[PDB]
Structure 1
Amino acid sequence: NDKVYENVTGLVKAVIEMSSKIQPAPPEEYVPMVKEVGLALRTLLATVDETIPLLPASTHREIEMAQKLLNSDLGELINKMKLAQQYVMTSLQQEYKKQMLTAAHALAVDAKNLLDVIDQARLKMLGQTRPH
C-alpha cells in the first residue's frame, strides 16, 4: 500500500525491460526506454521528498545522499545512451550499449538500497512514538 515501495518496483521494472531489450535495438527504440526509466526515477524522488517530513531528523541526511546517488546514476545512463547513439552502426555500438546496461543495473541496485534506508528509518520511527 506504500507509494515508495510501488515507485521503486516501477523503476526496477523499467530497468529490467530496457535490459532485456537493449541488445537488438536501434536508438529509436532505446531512447524511449531510457526516458521511461528517467520518469520512474523522477516519480520515486518526488515520493521520497514528500516522505522525508514524516521520518526522524537523524535519517534525513542518509536518505538524501541515497537520492543524489540515484540522480547521478541516471546522468551516467543518459551519458552512455548519448554515446551509444553517436557510435551507432559502428564497433563501439555494443560496447556503449553494455555500459548503458551497467549504468541501468547500478540505478536499480541504488533504488533498492534507498528503499532499505527508508524502511529502516520507518522502523526507527516506530521506536519514537508518544502515549497521547
Structure 2
Amino acid sequence: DKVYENVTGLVKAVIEMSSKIQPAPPEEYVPMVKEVGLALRTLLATVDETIPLLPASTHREIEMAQKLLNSDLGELINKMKLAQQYVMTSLQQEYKKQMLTAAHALAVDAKNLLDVIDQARLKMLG
C-alpha cells in the first residue's frame, strides 16, 4: 500500500519537525519544512497514480483532499518564514507555535486523505 506508506512518511516528518521546532533556532527550520514538503510531493504523486483505478464517483472528493494538503503546505511555509522574521523578538515563540499548528493541520489532513482513499478502495471492492 504505497499510499499508506507515503502518508506514514509524511506524518513522521511532521512529528519530527514538531519535536524540533521549540529547541531549534528559527533559521534551521528550512530543511525540516523541506523534508515535509518532499514527503507530501511523494504522497501526491502516488495518489495521482492511484486515482485512475478508483470509482469515478470518488475522484472529486480525493482531489479536494489533495488540494487541501497543498494549501496546508503553503501555510506552513508562510508561518516558517514569519518565525524566521521574528527571531529574537517578543513574537518568536508565538510564531513558532503558529508554525507547529500549521504542521499539525497538514498531518491531520494527510490522515483524512488516507481515509477518503481507503473508503474509495472499499467501494471498489463492491
Q: Same fold (TM over 0.5)?
A: yes
Structure 1 stretches of 4+ moved >4 Å: none
- Give RMSD over aligned pairs: 0.7
User: Is there any run of 5+ residues in structure 1 with no aligned partner, and where?
Assistant: 128-132
Q: What is the CA distance between 1:18 and its match in structure 2?
A: 0.4
Q: Residues 37 and 73 of structure 2 are in contact (CA less than 8 Å); yes or no, is this contact kept in structure 1?
A: yes
- For residues 47-91 of structure 1, give each alpha carbon's deviation from its aligned partner in whole angstroms, at most 9, with x where no partner exists: 000000010000000000000000000000000000000111111
Q: Distance in 2 between matches of 1:27 and 1:7?
A: 27
Q: What is the CA distance between 1:30 and its match in structure 2?
A: 1.4
Please give the TM-score of this superposition, normalised by the length of structure 2.
0.98
How many residue pairs get aligned? The number is 126
| Mapping 1:1-132, distance limit 5 Å | 2-127=1-126
Q: Distance in 2 between matches of 1:65 and 1:90?
A: 38
User: Is there any run of 5+ residues in structure 2 with no aligned partner, and where?
Assistant: none
| Helix, strand or coil at the partner of 1:91 | coil
Q: What is the CA distance between 1:27 and its match in structure 2?
A: 2.9
Q: Residues 27 and 84 of structure 2 are in contact (CA less than 8 Å); yes or no, is this contact kept in structure 1?
A: no
Q: Percent identity among equivalent residues? A: 100
Higher helix proportion:
2
Greater Cα offset, 18-27 or 65-74: 18-27
Greater Cα offset, 21-30 or 97-106: 21-30
Q: What is the CA distance between 1:29 and its match in structure 2?
A: 2.2
Q: Distance in 1 between matches of 2:4 and 2:105?
A: 18
Q: Distance in 2 between matches of 1:114 and 1:21?
A: 25
Q: Distance in 2 between matches of 1:34 and 1:124?
A: 35
Q: Distance in 1 between matches of 2:27 and 2:35?
A: 13
Q: Distance in 1 between matches of 2:33 and 2:89?
A: 21
Q: Residues 9 and 39 of structure 2 are in contact (CA less than 8 Å); yes or no, is this contact kept in structure 1?
A: yes
